Amino acid sequence: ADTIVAVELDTYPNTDIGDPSYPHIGIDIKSVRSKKTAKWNMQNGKVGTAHIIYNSVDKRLSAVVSYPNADSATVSYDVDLDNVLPEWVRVGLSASTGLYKETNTILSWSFTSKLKSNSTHETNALHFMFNQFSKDQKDLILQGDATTGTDGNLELTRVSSNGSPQGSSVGRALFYAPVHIWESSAVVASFEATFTFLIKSPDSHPADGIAFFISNIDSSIPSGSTGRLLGLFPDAN
Amino acid sequence: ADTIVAVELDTYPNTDIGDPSYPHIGIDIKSVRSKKTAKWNMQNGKVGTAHIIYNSVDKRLSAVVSYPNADSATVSYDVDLDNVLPEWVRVGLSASTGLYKETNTILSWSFTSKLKSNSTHETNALHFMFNQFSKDQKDLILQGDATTGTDGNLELTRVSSNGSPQGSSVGRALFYAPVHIWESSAVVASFEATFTFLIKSPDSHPADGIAFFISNIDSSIPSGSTGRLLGLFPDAN
Amino acid sequence: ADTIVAVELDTYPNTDIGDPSYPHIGIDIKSVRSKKTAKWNMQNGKVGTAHIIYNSVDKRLSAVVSYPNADSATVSYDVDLDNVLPEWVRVGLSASTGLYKETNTILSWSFTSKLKSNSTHETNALHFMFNQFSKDQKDLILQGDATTGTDGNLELTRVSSNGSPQGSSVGRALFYAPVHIWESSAVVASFEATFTFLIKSPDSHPADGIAFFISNIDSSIPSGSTGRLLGLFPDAN
Amino acid sequence: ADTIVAVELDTYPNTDIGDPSYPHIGIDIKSVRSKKTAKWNMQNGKVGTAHIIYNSVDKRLSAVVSYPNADSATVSYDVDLDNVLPEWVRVGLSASTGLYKETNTILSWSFTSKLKSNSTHETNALHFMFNQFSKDQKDLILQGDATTGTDGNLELTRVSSNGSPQGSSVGRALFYAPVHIWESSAVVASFEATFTFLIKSPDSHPADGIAFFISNIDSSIPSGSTGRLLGLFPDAN
Ligand SMILES: [Ca+2]
Ligand SMILES: [Ca+2]
Ligand SMILES: [Ca+2]
Ligand SMILES: [Ca+2]
Ligand SMILES: [Mn+2]
Ligand SMILES: [Mn+2]
Ligand SMILES: [Mn+2]
Ligand SMILES: [Mn+2]
């Protein structure tokens, strides 16, 4: 089905499916059951920043999530992405709410993929940066309940006009152009993703999380992937 | 119809339609009849480089075409692009051959659009760089006879297996993602395009030229735009 | 003496020396008597952003100063910088206070110089970005009363421990490495400067202003260049 | 003494000091006795490209050396650079010749250091790119026999007017500005270095090699560091 590789900012601990007993960041390879996790001291109502990095030489997918004036949370996992993802992929953001809710607002998003060939001065690159979103953001593919424009932000899950987050919501935002992650002549290949988010909930138990993902080009929201499955996976296997 | 703004590398002088009596570079705004031209000392069989620049403050579209070890050709035209092009556009390359022919090979292509808002640290940007093309270049829209892959280059017009350019050929290559050229909150907006080309013909009178263009998102090759019309315009008005 | 080219954010109108009757931005070429000015609706206590741009093709030095939620101020002047500045220069920021005062705080500073040769794929570039300053900022040359470190900012003029700006202060910050602005093989040359500032004064008549400048490598603060002369010029000619 | 961390392109095997029996690339931490090496199929007279990368999250210094149309050589070593290098350093290139010789020509050099803070949108960066060198390259510190200008290249070791490399030569080129490699508020820190070189010798046994290095700011050529010690180390310990 959809080949998924994602870094989840999981706000709700579903221990029955492997989530530890606290908010956390995790590296998911084809499954919602993180291959590796790290405790995340989430701050309700605060704007945070997540950094995802990876290069073909070291073969390690790492993420660093921090908030201003606080210590960072870091998680790493050794994975040869070439062995998992197709040649052409699409990058994006996903978020959902189940019985519990939260806003899943994106205020800025930037990505950069580089492929360096063995040729003299040969380098292929893509780089997008959104520091503000428009009502008609033509270079983005919105799936589910995701919308842009509301005071220049990307609302991944449904937020009522009064500012209250809705439950049972799922939405994803993908960049319009496919990204070339593997090249036969490439000696070095790497990508860098960064985004500022704002998880806010009037409850003491927000859910379910935000996730940066990389999938096959024709990826779409799996059925009933609201809640714990973050709009990325079809089941909890 | 198609809103076209292009910088043409016109190899053949069609004096009847306004072309001066020699190879040249020109700034075309909605018409093949350049609004401004500059003599271009073209070098058959040599790899050249073209630089196109524009910013919303100065409001001047400029281009610089040079070859190694030779002097450059420069042409500028004052134009408030906002008054000519839609909010969302698509960028690309076009080329054609008429009774006379030439190869219209692209070896590298890079583009960069920036939109700076009046907000603190707010900047939206897009940047692509192709230093090599693949047979299946999914992030490119090929129209007409254009193909990629042949020793990693983009062949805009038909070139036979033995390396001979075909006449009456037209082809264009557009980047997959739409580019946002105007933003309501932008204080400064600008774009930079650069490409290395290789015009080669066994004849002493090559034709018809290469052109970097910016059009409305759903642009396609006009009918009978081979030859002098460079695959951009439908007629010579 | 010192070859100076600067974009001044002049907060105090010294009409006797050519300043119009209001706060303004101006392009100074070798003299404090701006060659071109534009009214600037300054906002005391608000963080602003200034954008300075220039390229060798268009030959126009432009600046755009804005504040969040307000309209921008823009000023342009046609000047072939090659005819004014030496081959190697140094870039920096300057600020002063006279009988009237104000804080001249810099919160971020970035610069980018590019020189493109007529050679295939040849480009020389420099780019620095300061989004925070340290007490020991070794890559900066501080002259006068300028200091860094205070909550990660660059204080160009003296600010007492209680936060009050001192009068008769002058200070400048220059990047450590000389910048190459002209190259004999360059077909295109350009630079981009951007900085966020914070002009704040307890008085209704702040003075004297901030200025981004480009000088000869061994530039230093002229004598008695406090006040109206912004630490750039020795006299009011 | 000088804190040295370097990636050596060692053309001559000095087995007595730990060099394997063939040309190779190696990661040297404070000693010429590489902490890790990889066989390098060097090509006399061909222009090559070396890529050095490192980030504070993964803590792995890697290098990739390739030539057009050939397979690459890669070597990696896990090292927390913070534990080895001072806060402020200087980056550069070094090369030497002993009883055997070779040209140690640099045709292009680029470096990029990034420091991302835990603050929203805070990033400090430096980036230089030399695609050509001038006779008076003011932003470079030349030590030893290194010179720039000769057809726009950086000659690290002495090359006679007729093009013949001299033995017993040592020269280094350092960037003028100190680089900040550690910051107390940084969540992620990383640097990327790339350079095209040309090792050419009329002999079948060229020596001694090229090396990209990072040292303490006031670094200079150790005495008698010609030959096998590549101008970086004082002895073979
Ligand atoms: Ca969960
Ligand atoms: Ca023509
Ligand atoms: Ca004044
Ligand atoms: Ca050796
Ligand atoms: Mn989880
Ligand atoms: Mn024409
Ligand atoms: Mn003034
Ligand atoms: Mn060795």
Swiss-Prot record, chains A, B, C, D:
InterPro entries to which the protein is assigned, alphabetical: ConA-like_dom_sf (IPR013320), Lectin_LegA_CS (IPR000985), Lectin_legB_Mn/Ca_BS (IPR019825), Legume_lectin_dom (IPR001220), Leguminous_Lectin (IPR050258)
Residue numbers binding a carbohydrate: N14, G98, L99, Y100, D208, R228
Post-translational modification: Concanavalin A-like lectins of the Diocleinae subtribe undergo proteolytic processing referred to as circular permutation. The propeptide is split into an N-terminal and a C-terminal part, the gamma and beta chain, respectively. These are then religated in beta-gamma order to form the mature alpha chain. The beta and gamma chains can often be detected in cell extracts. Residues 1-118 of the mature chain, as displayed here, probably constitute the beta chain in the propeptide, residues 119-237 the gamma chain.
Single GO molecular function: metal ion binding
Keyword Manganese on entry: yes
Amino acids binding Mn(2+): E8, D10, D19, H24
Binding site for Ca(2+): D10, Y12, N14, D19
Pfam families: Lectin_legB (PF00139)
Coiled-coil regions listed: none
Keywords for the protein's UniProt record, in alphabetical order: Calcium, Lectin, Manganese, Mannose-binding, Metal-binding
Cysteine pairs bridged by disulfides in the record: none
UniProt record similarity statement: Belongs to the leguminous lectin family.
Oligomer and partners: Homotetramer.
Annotated function: Glucose/D-mannose specific lectin.
Note: Binds one manganese (or another transition metal) ion and one calcium ion. The metal ions are essential for the saccharide-binding and cell-agglutinating activities.
Name of the protein described by the UniProt record: Concanavalin-A
